[PDB]
Enzyme design. Structure first.
Site, PDB file in Angstrom:
ATOM      1  N   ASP A 144       0.817  -1.208   0.000  1.00 26.81           N
ATOM      2  CA  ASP A 144       0.000   0.000   0.000  1.00 26.81           C
ATOM      3  C   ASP A 144       0.855   1.263   0.000  1.00 26.81           C
ATOM      4  O   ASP A 144       1.191   1.795   1.057  1.00 26.81           O
ATOM      5  CB  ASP A 144      -0.941   0.009   1.205  1.00 26.81           C
ATOM      6  CG  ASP A 144      -1.452   1.396   1.531  1.00 26.81           C
ATOM      7  OD1 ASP A 144      -1.029   2.359   0.858  1.00 26.81           O
ATOM      8  OD2 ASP A 144      -2.277   1.524   2.459  1.00 26.81           O
ATOM      9  N   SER A 145       1.187   1.746  -1.192  1.00 25.39           N
ATOM     10  CA  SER A 145       1.970   2.967  -1.330  1.00 25.39           C
ATOM     11  C   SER A 145       1.090   4.199  -1.141  1.00 25.39           C
ATOM     12  O   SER A 145       1.427   5.291  -1.595  1.00 25.39           O
ATOM     13  CB  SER A 145       2.651   3.011  -2.697  1.00 25.39           C
ATOM     14  OG  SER A 145       2.578   1.751  -3.340  1.00 25.39           O
ATOM     15  N   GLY A 146      -0.041   4.013  -0.468  1.00 27.83           N
ATOM     16  CA  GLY A 146      -0.967   5.101  -0.213  1.00 27.83           C
ATOM     17  C   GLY A 146      -0.434   6.082   0.811  1.00 27.83           C
ATOM     18  O   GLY A 146       0.019   5.689   1.885  1.00 27.83           O
ATOM     19  N   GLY A 147      -0.487   7.366   0.477  1.00 28.52           N
ATOM     20  CA  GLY A 147       0.016   8.400   1.362  1.00 28.52           C
ATOM     21  C   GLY A 147       1.508   8.604   1.195  1.00 28.52           C
ATOM     22  O   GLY A 147       2.154   9.242   2.026  1.00 28.52           O
ATOM     23  N   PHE A 148       2.056   8.060   0.114  1.00 24.71           N
ATOM     24  CA  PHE A 148       3.479   8.200  -0.169  1.00 24.71           C
ATOM     25  C   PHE A 148       3.724   9.178  -1.312  1.00 24.71           C
ATOM     26  O   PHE A 148       4.695   9.934  -1.292  1.00 24.71           O
ATOM     27  CB  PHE A 148       4.113   6.841  -0.465  1.00 24.71           C
ATOM     28  CG  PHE A 148       4.731   6.192   0.739  1.00 24.71           C
ATOM     29  CD1 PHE A 148       5.982   6.581   1.186  1.00 24.71           C
ATOM     30  CD2 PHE A 148       4.055   5.203   1.431  1.00 24.71           C
ATOM     31  CE1 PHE A 148       6.551   5.990   2.297  1.00 24.71           C
ATOM     32  CE2 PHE A 148       4.619   4.609   2.544  1.00 24.71           C
ATOM     33  CZ  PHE A 148       5.868   5.002   2.977  1.00 24.71           C
ATOM     34  N   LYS A 170       4.227  10.194  -5.386  1.00 30.53           N
ATOM     35  CA  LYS A 170       4.675   9.728  -6.691  1.00 30.53           C
ATOM     36  C   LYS A 170       5.401   8.393  -6.577  1.00 30.53           C
ATOM     37  O   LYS A 170       5.250   7.517  -7.428  1.00 30.53           O
ATOM     38  CB  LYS A 170       5.587  10.765  -7.349  1.00 30.53           C
ATOM     39  CG  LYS A 170       5.916  11.955  -6.462  1.00 30.53           C
ATOM     40  CD  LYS A 170       6.764  12.976  -7.201  1.00 30.53           C
ATOM     41  CE  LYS A 170       6.096  14.342  -7.218  1.00 30.53           C
ATOM     42  NZ  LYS A 170       7.086  15.445  -7.364  1.00 30.53           N
ATOM     43  N   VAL A 171       6.192   8.248  -5.519  1.00 32.87           N
ATOM     44  CA  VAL A 171       6.942   7.020  -5.286  1.00 32.87           C
ATOM     45  C   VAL A 171       6.044   5.933  -4.707  1.00 32.87           C
ATOM     46  O   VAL A 171       5.051   6.224  -4.039  1.00 32.87           O
ATOM     47  CB  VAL A 171       8.127   7.255  -4.331  1.00 32.87           C
ATOM     48  CG1 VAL A 171       8.970   8.426  -4.812  1.00 32.87           C
ATOM     49  CG2 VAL A 171       7.627   7.496  -2.914  1.00 32.87           C
ATOM     50  N   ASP A 191      13.141  22.529  -3.639  1.00 32.71           N
ATOM     51  CA  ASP A 191      11.748  22.081  -3.700  1.00 32.71           C
ATOM     52  C   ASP A 191      11.168  21.606  -2.370  1.00 32.71           C
ATOM     53  O   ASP A 191      10.422  20.617  -2.324  1.00 32.71           O
ATOM     54  CB  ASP A 191      11.580  20.983  -4.744  1.00 32.71           C
ATOM     55  CG  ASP A 191      10.341  21.172  -5.584  1.00 32.71           C
ATOM     56  OD1 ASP A 191       9.520  20.213  -5.689  1.00 32.71           O
ATOM     57  OD2 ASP A 191      10.209  22.288  -6.151  1.00 32.71           O
TER      58      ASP A 191
END
Ligand SMILES: COc1ccc2c(c1)C1=NN(C(=O)CO)[C@H](c3ccc(OC(F)(F)F)c(F)c3)[C@@H]1CC2
Length: 272
Positions: free
Chosen positions: A17-21, A23-24, A131
């Site tokens: 679950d790359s949720g809340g990460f 673009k990566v 950035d």
């Protein structure tokens, strides 16, 4: 002199679950487990820029500090280029601010101090992030943070790679100094990162982002985030730091080592 890794070293048969990460995404490494995967280029070959890339990496590998995320290695393969960095369980800063729970003054302020040590370290190594923003603050399980550069902004070659037309793989303007707004020719300085830092302090105490043409020109004119929308208690010398750091004059803004010099005394006593 950086670690090389291979694509084979990872497994996709896993539902991460790359949720809340952002673009990566998350990757499972066969030997070492959970890691952060930044894919930067996919498509045709170009081993003509490999060496330069490596050099860049070598150079960026000199950045080593407790508030900057670690590179675990690179994947430099035929038509595929990736960066692989340490896992940060809670993801980016916004995601943790936009949580369903809540976070104390002591935490938020420690987050701030940590950020500061990061930035001061970076400028110490004569390097401009260019950035700074909540996306590029990552949080671990113990709410200790690390600064990232997930749009490769502070890079030259790797930057040039993430946009090579032959590649198969913006709000970020709300954190940008106004000097740099509609003028690409002025050389970023530590100060640009300081403006960005200011807008981040805002984002933190406001638990949300800020808010083109009209807006851009407005910010150039002197427009700043609506300091009214902080319904959370925010210290006087902190909104004073926010005010000072998003000054229209680069002369007017402070350095990070100075900021810390004045903030480290103020965290431990009235915040921790
Ligand atoms: C490719 O060779 C390398 C070699 C070393 C590193 C990276 C890539 C990284 N890449 N990183 C990314 O977040 C990329 O998305 C991380 C990073 C990059 C820049 C940072 O500060 C900046 F950009 F100077 F402002 C930072 F704090 C962390 C990570 C650092 C270490």
């Amino acid at each position: 002199n950086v670690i090389k890794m291979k694509s084979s070293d990872f497994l996709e048969s896993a539902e991460l679950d790359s949720g809340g990460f952002g673009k990566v995404s998350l990757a499972f490494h066969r030997t070492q487990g959970l890691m952060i995967m930044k894919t930067v280029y996919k498509g045709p070959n170009c081993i003509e820029h490999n060496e330069a890339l490596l050099e860049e990496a070598k150079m960026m590998n000199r950045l080593r500090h407790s508030r900057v995320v670690k590179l675990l290695g690179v994947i430099i393969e035929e038509g595929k280029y990736s960066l692989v960095m340490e896992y940060m369980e809670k993801g980016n800063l916004m995601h943790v601010l936009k949580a369903e729970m809540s976070t104390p003054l002591s935490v938020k302020g420690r987050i701030i101090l940590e950020i500061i040590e990061g930035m001061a370290y970076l400028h110490g190594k004569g390097v401009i992030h260019k950035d700074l923003k909540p996306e590029n603050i990552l949080v671990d399980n113990d709410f200790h943070i690390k600064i990232a550069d997930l749009g490769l902004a502070s890079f030259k070659m790797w930057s040039k790679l993430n946009n090579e037309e032959h590649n198969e793989l913006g709000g970020t303007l709300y954190y940008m100094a106004p000097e740099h707004l509609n003028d690409v020719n002025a050389k970023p300085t530590e100060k640009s990162d300081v403006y960005s830092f200011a807008v981040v302090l805002w984002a933190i105490f406001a638990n949300k982002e800020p808010y083109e043409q009209q807006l851009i020109m407005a910010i150039k004119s002197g427009n700043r985030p609506d300091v009214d929308d902080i319904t959370e208690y925010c210290p006087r010398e902190i909104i004073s730091l926010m005010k000072l750091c998003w000054e229209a004059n680069p002369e007017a803004r402070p350095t990070f080592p100075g900021i810390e010099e004045k903030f480290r005394p103020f965290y431990l006593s009235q915040l921790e």
